[PDB]
């Protein structure tokens, strides 16, 4: 209820989170199955996705899962690593409290342990060569890091597209980028290893009459949301009018106004036109003969999103349509949907760097889910690469070396923060122990063998063979993690543990 | 969590496995008067109420790739369940799950390689194709009770599928659900058949069958922009409801006549007063149609598919040369004589029972499928227990060479795969252990073709008996069971909303 | 474990149903009170009237109800023998699974036992040839004198023979259609006046001004609209007067003659009245106009009569007016309304052309229960004669088939090999419950009676059975009790089919 | 499941297998006594509390094997326990007990044949045979608790056996015990040595003694004198034997001198006056000795029974090559140097505690035994799991080869054999499952000498390491455990009264 026993209960809740995240980290981690009240079932290795809907059992677990969720953009792969590391911190913290140490003192011991961890971690590994220009060792990094987990087979294309997309947007903000401009559009219906780079926005493409060949000749786009195309309130209808002569006259007036805005469209030069609504198919064929791409069933929000993207301002009304205000789009292209039945619109200008998204195919719901998870992990890890290019030599090697350094520096502390240093060192030791326990290897045996290999051989890059390949040098496998990702991992874990410790009651 | 559900679903499917299995009865909740007896485990898996999330995800992972190939369900589900039970024993013996995953991946690679090596090609010879197709039909049509009717299905399906000789027509094959005469004989349509009446109001031998292919049929009426003069203005004139019906009929029928087509096909039953309207107007509307009929018309006579028909050019002038009707069963059934067989076909069974026809059509669907890919393919493997036990022997052989701890997992995989012919024998009542052990001896000492003859419960040299199973279905069931067992195994804990 | 347990439970439920029904077997019989939700009583000696109204929970009970219904629709009598064979076979199955032998072998062995038993019953039976009237009447009297409907089946048996002779020449072994020979009632009357009606008996007409009889009747099959539709309300405007509804009223008065002129060019004589949910309306104000120029309306036709008249007189089914052409018209010889021996407005059709020679029997009687007992007597008479004509060679009853079949099936299990041998032996030595049930319901020591029957079938006459009307085992009287061989064939085949299905059933599952 | 106690009473023994074993405690029954620990299961089963009659039968088989083999009674019990575990598992699988017996007997036949055909005879060599004797004896003695001075004892034993030159003699070694001191204080010496104190009265300076056994001393007041015979009377025959016995003092010298004397050996107390008389005669008689070793005296010295000198001339003389007595630190121990049989040696271990002493003499008996049946019949097999894996591989090959239900039974027997090195590795703390999988793979690819290195967990070709076990003990353990599990299994229920 109160005091140290209440904190022990908090520790038990944290262990409840940690022991279930224990089997999930690493490429060989055991996936969980996520079920909602609707009954939908999906399997996933991503700790972030597991925690996205992991419901509360006791409150502090909800607090800590919210804390972990709040760093998804920067933490990248290893958020489940963050959770298990913090759980190990709390598990050894329970031993420290059994030894009688007040919680705030193990908390500030952990923060100085994180400080010395950061100091050693800045010195733990070398820097990769230049990012923006050569990109080939970065291709190697993206292969050996991302395509190893759950994708059917690692191959160059997804990584190359991701790195190209980031490098188109990486250098302006003093070697930085914001993911507000890069997004994923998952659309099942094509071959799994077929995906295209998109320096623009994807929209569902309809021709009001498909009689004319698939083609595109974009020089500028008419971004219209006005009754230029006869509007409909999204209702099924089949019209009738007082007389066929009246219908003929209505068709004539339709084509006269279409021609006068042709003059409006051709005076600005927007050879492509788009609108939410569309007329009937035969008149739309006649419309396409007039060299304007009549479209229908265009996504509602997508229209103004692409309008703002293309530098134009959307046109809701006839009286608001001006020649200068239309969007100066660079190019439009017919991306094949994998299947030969249809194609999508992409609106993109190569000159302007903004809005470089990814357009992906898929065969199944959970498979495209893991595909977008993997590409988002690629995106965040390459943000960590571009922010600064020095690696951490991950896969347990960073954890084991950092724990060795913290244990070495432990005895240099004159106060019981020394015991806190030992606790933090053991918690870091747990991560290679976890990577072995979930894998098919005895945890402590191989973990301490890696420890000794680093003690006797002067290279901290030697870690645990999570991929079960013969070589044990983490450089030889070239499987790697960013230093910045590890910086955020350790800092988030220590902030999480200290926030849990500072809480005491209810 | 522990795999109680994943083995419970397998156990409840086990007794249905293969021919001479055990039946299941499925009944509706609430103690209402409705139940049915079924042997096909796929039917149980379709009708099962999966209260266990592990069982739900297992049956879902099966369904995406089990009903496609056909008849694999009763094998893939049982093999996956036995794998999960053996792996539960392994994890009880403190074997880590990822070790088991790696061991099973390598073991499945070895088993698939052994299956490919043992698979025998049968292309380039017509008589070998004939015998193989009858054998595979008999093994896939292993569901009907009447053995002469079993042979009827075998011959009919084989002759329907072989007449292709080319790329698949499974998209165009159909099995008409119309009730006929004796429940022991089968038939095939020389031109695909409909349940539509012919002769009383429409011509008998329709030369120049136009065959407009429509989807948006008339439930009651349609519309065209003409300036209607409706007489039923409001509640004050409800007695004038009929006034607009004639206009709504004519303003479409007249323009379709100018299009040049009386052969209006659509799914929707054009009613009796519209039957008067269409018959007098000189249009022969066919009130039942489907995607399958349109695509068969396309494949057989170079046609195409249409949709949302309002414009005449949006549908094809499906110039079928002539159409007749035939006298099979207790109906006057139109029979499209123009679309001859060889490019596509439709099978029809005689028999006055829907529920028997249900299992019939299920078995012919799975057959027609496996027949289609095995004609598209060229290889088959000795069926029964021969193929699976051969793969189990290969897994055992390569398992002994494996140094790692996954050797135990490989042996567990071999035992679980060996359990499948054990279940085949157990459902047939024979001494399962004796049969499987003597089979292990019979094709472990070489003699790779030796199999278990379930027809008498003895060792059988499968080379001459002819009981064979197509290579594609065996490879698909092997890979699907492997991947489903991996998916079920690799999850250790579950949480729910 | 679970499969054996669930099979045991299924067997127990089936055996509970069968043994609750066991006491009510055969002509002697003994009834129960039905455990129902109303609390009434039953004095029904038969067995079918329990299953047909049995509150069934277990699926085994439902499947035994389907067993009884199938047996009844196939041949009628034997509806309790089938279920008691089923129960005895399930008891033998309980023994066999107690020893642990597998269900699939049980199914295969029972199929073999069925085949050999059908052979045996076909063998020992008397190959009576059914081709002429004397043989038909002999079979009819042997079938009727052994039941309790003998008193009134006498006068109707020759007429049923005439009907079945109309259906087909008995040289054609194809079964006659039970449903084709429909049974009808004319209200009240005597007993002897129940007479054959070639053609069909039709429902009562309305006689405003239509003719009572017509030679060479041109029967039309009408199902289409009668009036300008009173579609939704009696008045469409202010109800001060029917100012505009007068238009649809006089349009009724005009469309009635329009349709009658559309009819007379074809010549439809009668009018089968479909219900008002299909029809627009039906009333005297128009039916009189149809009647006066020779369209007689007949009340409340039903789908079975529509199918029957289509099968008989060739009038195609109709749903609209435009098909009034000769396809919907039939040309009989004569159509009359007959009211002899008590007035009755049921119309009759006579001498019309027909591909199948459908024939009906009208039933009369001073009381409704007498009429319905005559109907069920003629029904079971047609059942037994049809199952005889389609299979010939009737068999003596009274457990004699069960004794002879058990004896030769036991020796067949003796000569048979494999696991199936003891299964067939158990099938044979448990199937003998029927003669045991007759002995129990006859007062004799059941086991001693069964032993005596088995001994007498050995080394001697194979037709000896338990006599229910004189008493005890008898051989000298050949006419102990006789049933068509199809009765025993259907009993054994359906019983074994359901038993082997039960064996095939495993692990009952709720949806 | 009725015999689960038979499994359990061997289960409490599997925690002691392997030289890298793991001890338990014998808790003394009741109070007034103290607990003591024990590594080897021989002492565990010896005076164990037994609750199950089948377990009692297993214990009796263990004692019988220990009696007729000596070392290795742990392996037979643990192997029988594993066999019975797998037997109950097979009975659960509805495999009948007698099929298990038949398959097990066939598997043991094949395994024994393969073991015999695979064991290596070190054969006709001298220096290589010397090294082989050295290391096999050292490793066989390493199976006991002792680790330090195994080599010295083994070298002394093989020296004695080489003095035997093949004539195996458990009694060639004279086995004296002495409490106190350290294990390093243990001494061997050639000849037959007595641990008494004789000094000068019977001199330690004598040659070619006439060794006899004589069970009557001077304290026995024995009646057989030259005077009157034995009588029971007091009238005139009270104590005439006291006057007669004065003749024995001189007769004990003069009779042997008349037969012919250079020395004499007597095993009983002698009165003083004959003590100096023998001192003046040159006779070396011992006050007391281990009278169970009278056969040892007869063998090593060539001595014979003298019938307590009731018949002085019905015996023949013994012989030696010197007489001596030496101060070994604290005991002034007698030294019959080089008695007639040169193979005579006397071993003493200065154990501070009697339990190390007793286990040491048990190990010495085991050593002399295994040296006998590996010198006259030289045969040895690679231990450390190598032999068990090899015979398991042979039995698995037989199981794959053999038809019938026996295949599963003998495969389970093979895996039960595999459990024995699995248990050894588990007691060692290594990754037992992975280690035995690696060894199984090594034998499957083919390495008849591959086994487990017990000093540090890993597989290794055991020929280079020199680790091994004697063939006879391993073969007898296999056969005895098989027959014990068989006799336990052949019983279904126990009847009690």
Q: For chain C, how far is it from start to end, CA to CA, in angstroms?
A: 22
Q: Give the pairing type, strands D345-351 and D187-190.
A: antiparallel
CA distance linking residue D448 with residue D382, whole number of Å: 9
SS (H, E, C) B273-319: HHHHHHHHHCCEEECCCCHHHHHHHHHHHCCCCCCCCCCHHHCCCCC
Nearest to B241 among C105, C231, C322 (CB): C231
Query: Is B56–A41 a contact, with Cβ atoms under 8 angstroms apart?
Result: yes
B window 68-107, beta carbon within 8 A of D: 93-95
Place of tokens 């190598």: D386
CA distance linking residue D461 with residue A77, whole number of Å: 44
State this model's resolution in angstroms: 3.8
Chain C residue closest in CA terms to B429:
C102
Q: Identify the burial level of B303 via C-beta atoms within 10 angstroms of its C-beta, where 0-12 means exposed, 13-18 middle and 19 or more buried.
A: buried
Structure tokens at D478: 């296999």
Q: Give the pairing type, strands C296-298 and D331-337.
A: unpaired
CA distance linking residue B193 with residue B185, whole number of Å: 17
Running DSSP on this structure, what letter comes out for residue C482? E
What interhelical angle do C150-167 and C368-389 show, nearest 10?
Answer: 50
Helix and strand element counts for chain B (H, E): 16, 17
**CB-based contacts of B131: which residues, under 8 Å, 6+ apart?**
B466
Place of tokens 């495999």: D95
Chain D residues near residue B95 by CB distance under 8 angstroms? 433
Residue B15 is labelled as binding a ligand: no
| Shortest Cα distance, chain A CAs vs residue B261, angstroms | 21
* Spacing of C-alpha B87 from chain mean position: 32
**CB-based contacts of A347: which residues, under 8 Å, 6+ apart?**
A200, A201, A203, A221, A306, A309, A310, A329, A332
Query: Do C18 and C121 lie in a common domain?
Result: yes
Query: Do C217 and C329 lie in a common domain?
Result: yes
What's the domain count of chain C?
3
Residue A141 is labelled as binding a ligand: no
Query: Do C200 and C295 lie in a common domain?
Result: yes
In 3D space, the residue among D82, D101, D80, D107 whose CA is nearest the CA of residue D399 turns out to be: D107
CA distance linking residue C447 with residue C450, whole number of Å: 5
Which residues does chain B break after (C to N > 2.5 Å)?
none
- Please indicate if any CB of chain A lies within 8 Å of the CB of B279: no
Structure tokens at D259: 């037969």
SS (H, E, C) C263-280: HHCCCCCEEECCCCCCCC
Long-range contacts of D53-57 (CB under 8 A, 24+ apart): D53/D494, D54/D3, D54/D5, D54/D6, D54/D488, D54/D491, D54/D494, D55/D5, D55/D6, D55/D8, D55/D9, D57/D6, D57/D484, D57/D487, D57/D488
CA distance linking residue D487 with residue D475, whole number of Å: 18
Q: Give the pairing type, strands C472-474 and C465-467.
A: antiparallel
- Please indicate if any CB of chain B lies within 8 Å of the CB of D28: no
Structure tokens at B82: 């036995």
Nearest to B27 among C230, C247, C510 (CB): C510
Residue B72 is labelled as binding a ligand: yes
CA distance linking residue A197 with residue C82, whole number of Å: 74
CA distance linking residue C464 with residue B301, whole number of Å: 71
Q: State the CB neighbour count (10 A cutoff) for residue B352.
A: 13
- Catalytic annotation on C80? yes
CA distance linking residue C345 with residue C326, whole number of Å: 27
CA distance linking residue B193 with residue C441, whole number of Å: 58
| Shortest Cα distance, chain B CAs vs residue D494, angstroms | 28
Q: Identify the burial level of D490 via C-beta atoms within 10 angstroms of its C-beta, where 0-12 means exposed, 13-18 middle and 19 or more buried.
A: exposed
Running DSSP on this structure, what letter comes out for residue D230? -
C201 with C184: CB under 8 angstroms? yes
CA distance linking residue D441 with residue D450, whole number of Å: 10
Residue B113 is labelled as binding a ligand: no
Chain B residue closest in CA terms to D411:
B437
Query: Do C205 and C300 lie in a common domain?
Result: yes
Helix and strand element counts for chain A (H, E): 17, 10
Query: Do C317 and C350 lie in a common domain?
Result: yes
> Domain spans of chain A?
1-129+390-506, 130-199+354-389, 200-353
CA distance linking residue D421 with residue D454, whole number of Å: 11
Chain A adjacent subunits, 3+ CB pairs under 8 A = B
Query: Do C208 and C345 lie in a common domain?
Result: yes
CA distance linking residue A231 with residue C325, whole number of Å: 52
Chain C residue closest in CA terms to B428:
C104
Chain D residues near residue B442 by CB distance under 8 angstroms? 403
Structure tokens at A231: 């509007």
Chain D residues near residue B400 by CB distance under 8 angstroms? 396, 440-441, 444
Q: For chain B, how far is it from start to end, CA to CA, in angstroms?
A: 16
Query: Is B95–D440 a contact, with Cβ atoms under 8 angstroms apart?
Result: no
Query: Do C344 and C218 lie in a common domain?
Result: yes
Query: Do C325 and C218 lie in a common domain?
Result: yes
**Distances in whole angstroms, Cα of residue A358 to Cα of each of A5, A178, A301, A337:** 50, 15, 18, 13
Running DSSP on this structure, what letter comes out for residue D234? -
Q: Give the pairing type, strands C218-220 and B186-189.
A: unpaired
Range of the structural domain that residue C155 is part of: 129-194+359-392
Query: Do C343 and C220 lie in a common domain?
Result: yes
Structure tokens at C410: 């036991």
Chain B residue closest in CA terms to A246:
B227
Query: Is D437–B401 a contact, with Cβ atoms under 8 angstroms apart?
Result: no
Q: How many CA atoms lie within 13 A of B364 on its CB side?
A: 31
Domain end, chosen from C376, C392, C408, is at: C392
Query: Do C10 and C90 lie in a common domain?
Result: yes
CA distance linking residue D402 with residue D417, whole number of Å: 18
Chain A residues near residue B98 by CB distance under 8 angstroms? 28, 30, 438-440
Q: Is A27 helix (H, G, I), strand (E, B) or coil?
A: coil
Q: Is C58 helix (H, G, I), strand (E, B) or coil?
A: coil
Structure obtained using: cryo-EM
Query: Do C280 and C411 lie in a common domain?
Result: no
Structure tokens at B393: 């022997």
Beta bridge partners of B404: none
Query: Do C11 and C99 lie in a common domain?
Result: yes
SS (H, E, C) C220-251: ECCCCCCCCCCCCCCCCCCCCCCCCHHHHHHH
- Please indicate if any CB of chain C lies within 8 Å of the CB of B15: yes
In 3D space, the residue among C302, B490, D363, D218 whose CA is nearest the CA of residue A23 turns out to be: B490
Chain D residues near residue B437 by CB distance under 8 angstroms? 403-408
| Shortest Cα distance, chain B CAs vs residue C103, angstroms | 7
């Amino acid at each position: 209820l109160m005091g140290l026993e209440a904190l022990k209960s908090h520790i038990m809740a944290a262990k409840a989170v940690a022991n279930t995240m224990r089997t999930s980290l690493g490429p060989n981690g055991l996936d969980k199955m996520m079920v909602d009240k609707d009954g939908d079932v999906t399997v996933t290795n991503d700790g972030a996705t597991i925690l996205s809907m992991m419901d509360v059992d006791h409150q502090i677990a909800k607090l800590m899962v919210e804390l972990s969720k709040s760093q998804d953009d920067e933490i990248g792969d290893g958020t489940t690593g963050v959770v298990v590391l913090a759980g190990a911190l709390l598990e050894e913290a329970e031993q420290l409290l059994d030894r009688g140490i007040h919680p705030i003192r193990i908390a500030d011991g952990y923060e100085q342990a994180a400080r010395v961890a950061i100091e050693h971690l800045d010195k733990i590994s070398d820097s990769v060569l230049v990012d923006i220009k050569d990109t080939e060792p970065l291709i190697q990094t993206a292969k050996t890091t991302l395509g190893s987990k759950v994708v059917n087979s690692c191959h160059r294309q997804m990584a190359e597209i991701a790195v190209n997309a980031v490098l188109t947007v990486a250098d302006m903000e003093r070697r930085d980028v914001d993911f507000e401009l890069i997004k994923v559009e998952g659309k099942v219906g094509g071959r799994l290893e077929d995906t295209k780079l998109i320096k623009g926005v994807i929209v569902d493409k309809d021709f009001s009459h498909p009689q004319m060949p698939k083609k595109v000749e974009d020089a500028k786009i008419a971004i219209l949301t006005c009754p230029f195309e006869p509007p409909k309130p999204k209702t099924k209808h089949k019209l009738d009018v007082t007389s066929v002569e009246d219908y003929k006259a209505l068709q004539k007036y339709e084509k006269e106004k279409f021609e006068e805005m042709i003059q409006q469209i051709k005076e600005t030069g927007a050879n492509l036109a788009i609108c939410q609504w569309g007329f009937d198919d035969e008149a739309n064929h006649l419309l396409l003969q007039n060299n304007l791409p009549a479209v229908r069933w265009v996504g509602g929000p997508e229209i103004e999103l692409i309008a703002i993207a293309t530098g134009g301002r959307i046109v809701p009304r006839f009286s608001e349509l001006t020649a200068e205000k239309l969007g100066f789009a660079g190019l439009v292209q017919e991306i094949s949907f994998g299947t030969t039945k249809d194609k999508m619109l992409v609106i993109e200008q190569c000159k302007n760097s903004r809005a470089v998204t990814i357009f992906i195919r898929g065969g199944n719901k959970m498979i495209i889910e893991e595909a977008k998870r993997s590409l988002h992990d690629a995106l965040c890890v390459i943000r960590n690469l571009i922010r600064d290019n020095r690696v951490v030599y991950g896969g347990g090697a960073a954890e084991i070396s950092c724990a060795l350094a913290v244990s070495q520096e432990a005895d240099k502390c004159p106060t019981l923060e020394q015991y806190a240093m030992r606790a933090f060192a053991d918690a870091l030791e747990v991560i290679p122990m976890a990577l072995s326990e979930n894998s098919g290897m005895n945890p402590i045996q191989t973990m301490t063998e890696v420890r000794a290999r680093q003690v006797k051989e002067m290279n901290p890059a030697l870690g645990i063979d999570c991929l079960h390949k013969g070589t044990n040098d983490m450089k030889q496998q070239h499987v790697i993690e960013t230093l910045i990702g590890k910086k955020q991992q350790i800092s988030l874990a220590t902030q999480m543990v200290r926030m849990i410790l500072k809480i005491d009651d209810i | 969590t522990s795999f109680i559900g994943a083995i419970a679903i397998g156990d409840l499917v086990k007794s249905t496995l293969g021919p001479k299995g055990m039946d299941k009865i499925l009944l509706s909740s609430g103690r209402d008067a409705s139940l049915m007896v079924t042997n096909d485990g796929a039917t149980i898996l379709k009708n099962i109420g999966v209260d266990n999330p592990a069982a739900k995800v297992l049956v879902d992972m099966s369904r995406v790739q089990d009903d496609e190939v056909g008849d694999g369900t009763t094998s893939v589900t049982v093999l996956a369940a036995e794998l999960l039970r053996e792996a539960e024993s392994l994890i009880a013996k403190k074997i880590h799950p990822q070790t088991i995953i790696a061991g099973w991946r390598e073991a499945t690679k070895a088993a698939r390689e052994a299956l490919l090596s043992s698979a025998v090609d049968h292309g380039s010879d017509e008589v070998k194709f004939r015998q193989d197709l009858m054998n595979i039909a008999g093994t896939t049509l292993s569901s009907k009770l009447l053995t002469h009717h079993k042979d009827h299905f075998t011959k009919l399906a084989v002759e329907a599928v072989l007449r292709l000789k080319g790329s698949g027509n499974l998209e165009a094959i159909h099995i008409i659900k119309k009730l006929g005469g004796s429940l022991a004989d089968s038939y095939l349509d020389e031109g695909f058949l409909l349940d539509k009446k012919i002769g009383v109001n429409q011509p008998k031998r329709i030369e120049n069958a136009k065959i407009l292919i429509a989807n948006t049929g008339m439930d009651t009426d349609k519309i065209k922009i003409f300036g209607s003069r409706v007489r039923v203005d409001s509640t004050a004139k409800v007695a004038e409801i009929e006034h607009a019906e004639k206009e709504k009929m004519k303003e479409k029928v007249e323009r379709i006549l100018k299009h040049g087509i009386n052969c209006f096909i659509n799914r929707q039953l054009i009613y009796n007063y519209p039957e008067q309207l269409f018959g007098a107007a000189g249009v022969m509307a066919i009130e039942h149609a489907d995607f399958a009929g349109v695509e068969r018309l396309a494949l057989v006579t170079g046609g195409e598919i249409a949709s949302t028909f309002d414009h005449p050019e949006l549908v094809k002038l499906g110039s079928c040369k002539l159409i007749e009707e035939v006298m099979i069963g207790e109906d006057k059934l139109i029979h499209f004589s123009g679309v001859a067989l060889g490019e596509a076909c439709t099978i029809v069974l005689r028999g006055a029972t829907q529920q028997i026809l249900d299992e019939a059509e299920r078995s012919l669907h799975d057959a027609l499928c496996v027949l289609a890919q095995t004609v598209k393919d060229s290889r088959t493997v000795y069926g029964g227990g021969c193929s699976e036990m051969l793969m189990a022997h290969a897994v055992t052989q390569l398992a002994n060479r494996t140094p790692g701890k996954e050797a135990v997992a490989m042996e567990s995989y071999a035992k679980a795969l060996r359990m499948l012919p054990t279940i085949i024998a157990d459902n047939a009542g024979y001494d399962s252990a004796d049969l499987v052990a003597q089979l292990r001896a019979a094709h472990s000492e070489g003699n790779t073709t030796a199999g278990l003859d379930m027809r008498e419960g003895t060792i059988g040299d499968m080379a001459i008996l002819g009981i064979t199973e197509s290579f594609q279905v065996k490879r698909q069931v092997l890979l699907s069971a492997a991947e489903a067992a991996e998916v079920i195994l690799r999850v250790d804990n579950i949480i729910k909303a | 474990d679970k499969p054996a347990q669930i099979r045991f439970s299924n067997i127990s439920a089936a055996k509970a149903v069968a043994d609750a029904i066991r006491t009510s077997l055969g002509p002697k019989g003994m009834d129960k009170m039905i455990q129902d939700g109303k609390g009434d009583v039953t004095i029904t000696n038969d067995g079918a009237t329990i299953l047909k109204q049995m509150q069934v929970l277990h699926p085994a009970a439902r499947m035994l109800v389907e067993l009884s219904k199938a047996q009844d629709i196939e041949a009628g009598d034997g509806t309790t023998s089938v279920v008691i064979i089923a129960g005895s076979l399930l008891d033998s199955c309980t023994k066999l699974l107690q020893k642990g032998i597998h269900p699939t072998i049980i199914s295969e062995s029972f199929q073999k036992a069925l085949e050999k038993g059908i052979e045996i019953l076909t063998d020992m039976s008397r190959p009576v040839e059914l081709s002429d009237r004397e043989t038909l009447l002999n079979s009819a009297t042997t079938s009727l004198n052994s039941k309790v409907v003998s008193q009134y089946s006498s006068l109707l048996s020759p007429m049923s023979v005439n009907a079945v002779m109309k259906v087909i020449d008995p040289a054609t072994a194809t079964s006659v259609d039970l449903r084709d020979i429909k049974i009808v009632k004319k209200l009240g009357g005597t007993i002897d006046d129940c007479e054959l009606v070639e053609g069909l008996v039709l429902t009562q007409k309305v006689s405003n001004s239509g003719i009572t009889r017509v030679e060479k009747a041109k029967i039309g099959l009408i199902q289409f609209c009668l009036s300008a539709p009173k579609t939704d309300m009696d008045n469409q405007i202010v109800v001060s007067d029917y100012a505009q509804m007068d238009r649809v009223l006089r349009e009724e008065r005009a469309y009635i003659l329009n349709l009658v002129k559309q009819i007379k060019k074809t010549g439809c004589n009668v009018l089968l009245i479909q219900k008002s949910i299909l029809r627009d309306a039906l009333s005297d104000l128009a039916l009189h106009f149809l009647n006066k120029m020779k369209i007689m309306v007949i009340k409340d036709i039903e789908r079975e009569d529509i199918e029957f008249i289509c099968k008989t007189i060739g009038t195609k089914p109709v749903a609209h007016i435009d098909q009034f052409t000769a396809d919907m018209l039939g040309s009989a010889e004569l159509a009359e309304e007959v009211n002899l021996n008590g007035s009755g407005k049921l119309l009759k059709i006579t001498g019309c052309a027909s591909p199948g020679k459908t024939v009906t029997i009208v039933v009369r009687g001073s009381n409704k229960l007498v009429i319905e007992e005559a109907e069920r007597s003629i029904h079971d008479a047609l059942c037994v004669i049809r199952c005889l004509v389609k299979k010939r060679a009737l068999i003596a009853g009274g457990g004699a088939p069960e004794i002879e079949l058990a004896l030769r099936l036991t020796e067949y299990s003796r000569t048979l090999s494999g696991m199936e041998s003891y299964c067939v032996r158990a099938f044979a030595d448990a199937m003998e419950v029927i003669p045991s049930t007759l002995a129990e319901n006859a007062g004799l020591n059941p086991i001693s009676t069964v032993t005596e029957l088995r001994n007498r079938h050995a080394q001697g006459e194979k037709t000896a059975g338990i006599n229910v009307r004189k008493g005890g085992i008898s051989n000298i009287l050949e006419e102990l009790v006789v049933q068509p061989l199809l009765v025993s064939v259907s009993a054994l085949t359906l019983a074994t089919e359901t038993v082997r299905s039960i064996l095939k059933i495993d692990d009952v599952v709720n949806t």
